[PDB]
RNA sequence: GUCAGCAUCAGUUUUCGGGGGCGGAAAAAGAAUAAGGGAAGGUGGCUGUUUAUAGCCCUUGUUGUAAUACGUCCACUGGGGACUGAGGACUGCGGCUUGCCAAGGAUGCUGACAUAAUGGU
RNA sequence: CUGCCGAAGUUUCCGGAUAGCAGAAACUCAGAUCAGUUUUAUGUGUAAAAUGAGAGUUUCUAGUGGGCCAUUUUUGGUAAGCAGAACUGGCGAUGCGGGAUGAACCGAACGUGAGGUUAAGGUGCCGGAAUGUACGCUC
């Protein structure tokens, strides 16, 4: 048994058998979608741009 | 390349202390882990504030606000010697506060054979008036009729020509 | 007279080798031309041959030749390693290789 | 990015050093080279620098039958020559080979006048060496140490001047017929959108 | 026949909802975070985010002419070659290891990546005191399945965020057997990562330097 | 050399040159 | 499965080349300072268990049978079984006559003879 | 992890001393 | 001297992902610098080091520090395009792009183009 | 029997790209377009001045959920090259659907040559 | 002839017995103990968490009992060298890459091979690898 080692990452086959949830997995979501808040307090940015 | 870091600690709040000073100082290093501790060996070395006792609290890469402008920078420095005590004040002109610190590592390696760590930042402003502008060549760059000509013009072995090498 | 030469030509440097040790299973090419890794790589795979000449008439012959395959690319100036079937003997430092173009994959 | 059978490289304005590693390197790469005009070479520092360097270079010289001890020669070529074979595994048999693979000569004897020579734009002097910096000429400096040729090689190259001018002159005068004729022809212009 | 094979699906199923569990709660770890720290910069306010409890060593420095002060703590962390790679639990009775051991190994803080390429490439477990090569579910259920690890994924999530059972299964997984770096060290190695070396602590750079290993 | 004098040197004048910077 | 040798040079005794007296045969160099075998750079190799060859292949010829000593024809008779696994080799001092018969009986029972043609 | 307040506690900018 | 670096001085890119495009000095940095703008949209504002540029005789009005639609609106102004396209110098290099460009095909048809044109060589005796 | 060429795979590896998430000052810029401020290395004008017959700098609004760089991730993807083929009926873990499969280690399609190719000494 | 295991390189008492290192035989021990290691606690020493490893003893029988080099502390110093300890290292039983060459320098520790990638050191030529890139100094 295991004759040979084979790379899940390399092998669609092996790495089915090792997780059975690559399946499924939706790696891409698109969250920033919505209007983007640019969140930056102003005395954050004074004490970014201090000096 | 360097990045300019924007770097906040303080020691760990106890009894003594519940609410211990802030401090942050605006240093240049490769990555965030070398400014941090850079930053610790600061605080050491200027408020004797232990890297142990102590903890960071914010970190912040800080761009160029106008890297599309030319200006002149004025640096302080706390250079190190055979005996150890010297300061400068050295003027580059370039677009990026990063590259006049850039500029001023090379300079001084070159020069007096200087290292990271025998280089200390002390301050870096912009000078933005040719008035308070001091070194010559600072001024003959500022100059409002400033034009020269390109000096150091300088596989394919065996060119079957003679080389231009003018206009 | 010039409808032939389907070939690139080539110099047989050296072996692969360090300051003191030689591996000649595996020889330094220099196809002309090339002139960086990144150009190194269109010649990848292809098949270099050493065409020389012996005395008798073998197959009714005089001319034969040692094939070989392009392997992969050996510094920043466009040199590329060789296998060759028969490793090349070391009288052929300096002389001719023929890279054909084949197996091509333009 | 490519090789002849046998390259004819013109000296003048090269440097000693930069110009006899790339020939020693051609010379292991199996070509033939031919280094004309070597008296015509430059070497950096300034020319009693280099005259003292070959000055202390006569001092090497055995006890015994100095006829046994390093022998000095102050031709411009061989002192090309000597520089290049430095660059060479010259005590085996591949460095032997590479040396007989090459050809020095002072000045340009006939059968290579009449050759195109090439140049090496890693070994000019022009752009070697920062402007103003002090440098030698080979020429001047064999002929101080002992060379006796200066003057008719000055002599010969001149007359070799003049012959090879008028047969330029003649060049470009079928050059300019050739040109007039080149845009006669409305074929030129009918499909030169291949950029020729 | 008929009950292993329904036994077998089930636990494929049950297997499979933990790993899509272990992915959301990574996911929102990550993503909370940067809630957090948005909120501070938003209020002007600092947040500090939490201390790492899980390192990543890697001994960069050979067996030969090492003091045996050294040489011993190596010997317990299971680095006795170069270019090996553990696990360890970053606390602060480690903190003093790594602090002695500076010159010899390199070590930081391994994202979600580098542990699940390391232990789906590299990744062998101590069976019966053998090397043998995690190629299924089957070989961590019947050497972890007292402590409920049944997957690659259920290891994978106990040393990532640093379980109950993280001695356990460290001390399963032999140590990763990582290669020279693709693209070779910096130009001199052992002097401090710091100062332009490639030793002693760095941080979130130990991902690139893995990468390069694998 | 080209001046007078070698600047290559002896092996143990180089050790004990390491040895008179140390002390 | 092909047979492949992990060295084909014989492993010669030291200086055996540079002596009459002493002989090719090997012979482990018990001196102190012998740096053949202390293993300098450029000295000759020396036998190691790291050169044994595959146990499958081992003591198979290039054919990939294994040469078996044959005196007579009831030895041949010994080699029906394994006619695809050991090849005939007659004895050196067998004569004529017997070389013949051998052969023969080899030939009709289907065992490879290695050196048929002799005598 | 845990939050810091900076409300009372503004940030006091340092740089060395010679 | 022909070549100068000054502002309003219009250069050729020679190193750099931008080899062969046009852009202005608009302003100097140092011995060793410029800041550079293009009208191209595909080539943005950006300082270069002088040894990345090759100085073009055709020099522009231009005030210092322009912003890059000034620089545009001054270069459609002048007509800095197609007036480097007037030199001989611009020429050979768009022909040698268009030479680089070229297929098999088109290369045999070159091959039949001279040898069409070098059927005259006919000249007055 | 020897030696070659190609394809589809497996293991190790190297080298180019393409697309898409997420992150930072939710990049900094920048462009376009509205306020106000300042001036110059002072333009038109008249050495001195404040956008006019050049323009520049600073702040704010806007176009904005701007782009891009960068970090990071994809159980996203497209190629080129090299080395290797150990094991020998069937079991196993899986995938697609009794069957089929890249899923416990290479097979298939062809050639050339035997007066030579390979391997030797 | 091949294979495996493999030291001591010196205490402590009168040439030695002893111990130490290496093996063998026979026992018990896995809800157990160890450790050239780090934390925690009590006042550098003592005591109880981390990590690693199965951990113990009894018998008996080989070999070893030198030195060299270097670091640090320290004792005096002295024309200047150096001299006296301690300290753990390196060599010693050990080839290999680099340092042009090398007992002591930088890497690295070894079955036979293929491929890939590096260390130290390097990329003008001898010599495998950029007559690379950027900024300065020097005649």
Redesign the pocket.
């Known amino acids: 048994?295991?004759?040979?080692?084979?790379?899940p990452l390399?092998?669609?086959?092996?790495?089915?058998?090792l997780?059975?949830?690559?399946?499924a997995?939706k790696?891409?979501?698109?969250?920033?979608?919505?209007?983007?808040?640019?969140?930056?307090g102003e005395k954050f940015?004074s004490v970014?741009?201090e000096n | 390349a360097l990045k300019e870091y924007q770097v906040v600690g303080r020691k760990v709040p106890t009894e003594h202390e519940p609410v211990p000073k802030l401090f942050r100082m605006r240093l240049f290093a490769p990555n965030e882990s070398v400014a941090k501790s850079r930053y610790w060996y600061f605080l050491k070395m200027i408020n004797k504030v232990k890297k142990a006792t102590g903890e960071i609290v914010a970190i912040?890469?800080?761009?160029?606000?106008?890297?599309?402008?030319?200006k002149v920078f004025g640096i302080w420095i706390r250079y190190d010697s055979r005996s150890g005590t010297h300061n400068m004040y050295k003027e580059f002109r370039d677009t990026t506060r990063v590259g006049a610190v850039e500029?001023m590592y090379?300079?001084m390696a070159?020069?007096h054979r200087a290292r990271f760590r025998s280089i200390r930042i002390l301050k870096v402003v912009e000078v933005e008036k040719?008035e308070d502008v001091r070194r010559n060549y600072v001024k003959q760059?500022?100059?409002?009729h400033?034009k020269f000509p390109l000096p150091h013009r300088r596989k394919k072995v065996f060119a079957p020509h003679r080389p231009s090498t003018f206009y | 007279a010039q409808g032939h030469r389907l070939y690139v030509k080539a110099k047989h440097?050296?072996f692969?080798?360090?300051?003191?040790?030689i591996h000649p299973?595996?020889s330094?090419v220099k196809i002309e031309g090339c002139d960086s890794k990144?150009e190194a790589?269109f010649y990848?795979?292809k098949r270099v041959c050493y065409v020389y000449k012996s005395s008798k008439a073998?197959?009714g012959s005089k001319i034969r030749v040692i094939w070989g395959?392009?392997?992969?690319p050996?510094?920043?100036?466009g040199?590329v390693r060789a296998?060759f079937?028969?490793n090349l003997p070391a009288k052929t430092f300096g002389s001719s290789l023929r890279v054909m173009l084949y197996?091509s994959?333009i | 990015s490519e090789f002849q059978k046998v390259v004819v490289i013109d000296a003048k304005g090269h440097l000693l050093?930069?110009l006899?590693?790339?020939v020693?390197?051609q010379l292991?790469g199996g070509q033939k080279v031919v280094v004309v005009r070597c008296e015509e070479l430059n070497i950096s520092?300034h020319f009693f620098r280099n005259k003292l360097k070959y000055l202390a270079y006569l001092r090497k010289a055995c006890r015994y039958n100095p006829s046994r001890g390093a022998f000095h020669f102050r031709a411009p070529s061989r002192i090309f020559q000597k520089a290049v074979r430095?660059?060479?595994?010259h005590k085996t048999a591949?460095?032997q080979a590479a040396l007989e693979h090459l050809q020095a000569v002072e000045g340009i004897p006939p059968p290579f006048d009449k050759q195109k020579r090439v140049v090496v734009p890693?070994?000019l002097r022009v752009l070697r060496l920062?402007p103003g910096?002090?440098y030698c000429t080979v020429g001047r400096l064999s002929s101080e140490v002992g060379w006796k040729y200066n003057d008719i090689v000055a002599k010969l190259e001149e007359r070799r001047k003049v012959k090879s001018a008028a047969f330029y002159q003649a060049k470009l005068a079928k050059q300019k017929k050739i040109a007039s004729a080149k845009e006669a022809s409305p074929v030129n212009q009918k499909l030169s959108q291949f950029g020729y | 026949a008929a009950e292993?094979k329904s036994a077998?699906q089930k636990?494929?199923e049950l297997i499979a909802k933990r790993?899509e569990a272990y992915?959301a709660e990574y996911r929102a770890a990550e993503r909370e975070q940067?809630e957090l720290?948005?909120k501070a910069?938003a209020e002007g306010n600092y947040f500090v985010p939490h201390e790492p409890k899980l390192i990543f060593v890697v001994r960069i420095?050979?067996?030969?002419?090492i003091?045996?002060?050294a040489?011993?703590?190596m010997?317990?962390?299971?680095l006795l070659?170069?270019n090996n790679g553990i696990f360890v639990?970053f606390?602060?009775?480690?903190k003093?290891?790594l602090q002695?051991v500076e010159p010899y190994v390199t070590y930081g803080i391994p994202?979600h990546?580098?542990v699940?390429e390391l232990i789906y490439?590299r990744g062998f477990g101590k069976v019966n005191?053998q090397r043998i090569p995690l190629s299924?579910?089957?070989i961590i259920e019947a050497a972890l399945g007292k402590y409920s690890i049944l997957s690659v994924?259920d290891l994978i999530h106990e040393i990532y965020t640093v379980g109950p059972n993280?001695?356990q299964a460290?001390?399963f997984l032999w140590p990763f057997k990582l290669?020279?770096?693709?693209?070779?060290?910096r130009?001199?190695?052992?002097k401090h990562f710091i100062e332009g070396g490639d030793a002693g602590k760095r941080d979130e750079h130990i991902?690139?330097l893995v990468?390069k290993m694998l | 050399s080209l001046k007078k004098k070698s600047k290559?040197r002896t092996?143990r004048l180089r050790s004990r040159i390491e040895?008179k910077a140390?002390? | 499965?092909?047979i492949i040798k992990?060295?084909?040079?014989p492993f010669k005794r030291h200086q055996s080349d540079r002596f009459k007296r002493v002989g090719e045969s090997?012979?482990?160099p018990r001196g102190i300072d012998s740096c053949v075998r202390?293993?300098?750079?450029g000295t000759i190799?020396?036998?190691?268990?790291?050169?044994?060859n595959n146990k499958?292949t081992r003591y198979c010829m290039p054919n990939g049978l294994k040469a078996f000593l044959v005196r007579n024809v009831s030895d041949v008779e010994l080699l029906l079984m394994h006619n695809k696994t050991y090849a005939a080799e007659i004895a050196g001092n067998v004569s004529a006559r017997k070389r013949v018969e051998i052969v023969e009986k080899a030939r009709a029972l289907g065992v490879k003879v290695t050196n048929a043609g002799a005598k | 992890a845990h939050f810091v307040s900076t409300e009372n506690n503004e940030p006091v900018t340092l740089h060395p001393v010679a | 001297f022909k070549r100068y670096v000054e502002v309003g001085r219009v250069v050729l890119v020679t190193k750099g992902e931008y080899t062969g495009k046009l852009a202005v000095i608009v302003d100097?940095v140092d011995?060793?610098r410029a800041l550079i703008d293009s009208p191209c949209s595909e080539f943005?504002?950006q300082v270069i080091?002088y040894?990345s540029v090759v100085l073009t005789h055709i020099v522009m009005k231009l005030?210092?520090?322009?912003?890059?639609?000034?620089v545009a609106?001054?270069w459609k102004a002048q007509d800095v395009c197609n007036k480097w396209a007037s030199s001989a110098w611009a020429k050979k290099l768009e022909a040698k792009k268009v030479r680089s460009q070229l297929n098999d095909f088109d290369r045999f048809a070159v091959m039949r183009l001279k040898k069409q044109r070098r059927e005259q060589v006919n000249v007055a005796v």
């Open positions: 048994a295991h004759v040979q080692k084979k790379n390399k092998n669609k086959a092996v790495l089915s058998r997780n059975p949830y690559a399946k997995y790696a891409n979501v698109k969250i920033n979608s919505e209007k983007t808040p640019k969140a930056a940015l970014l741009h | 912040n890469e800080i761009s160029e606000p106008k890297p599309l402008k030319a500029a090379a300079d070159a020069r040719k760059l500022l100059n409002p400033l | 440097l050296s692969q080798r360090s300051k003191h040790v299973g595996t330094i990144e790589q990848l795979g073998v197959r395959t392009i392997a992969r050996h510094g920043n100036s040199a296998r079937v028969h197996p994959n | 050093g930069r006899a590693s790339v020693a390197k292991l520092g430095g660059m060479l595994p591949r460095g890693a070994a920062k910096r002090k | 292993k077998r636990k494929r790993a992915e940067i720290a948005r910069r420095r050979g067996i030969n002419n003091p045996p002060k040489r011993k703590i010997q317990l962390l299971r070659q170069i639990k606390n602060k009775a480690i003093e290891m002695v994202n990546k580098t699940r490439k005191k299924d579910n089957a994924e993280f001695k460290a001390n290669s020279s770096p693709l693209g070779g060290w130009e001199r190695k052992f991902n690139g990468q | 290559r092996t040895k140390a002390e | 499965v092909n992990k060295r084909t040079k090997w012979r482990k202390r293993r300098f750079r190799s020396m036998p190691k268990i790291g050169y044994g499958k | 100097i011995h060793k943005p504002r080091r040894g005030p210092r520090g322009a912003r890059s639609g000034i609106k001054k």
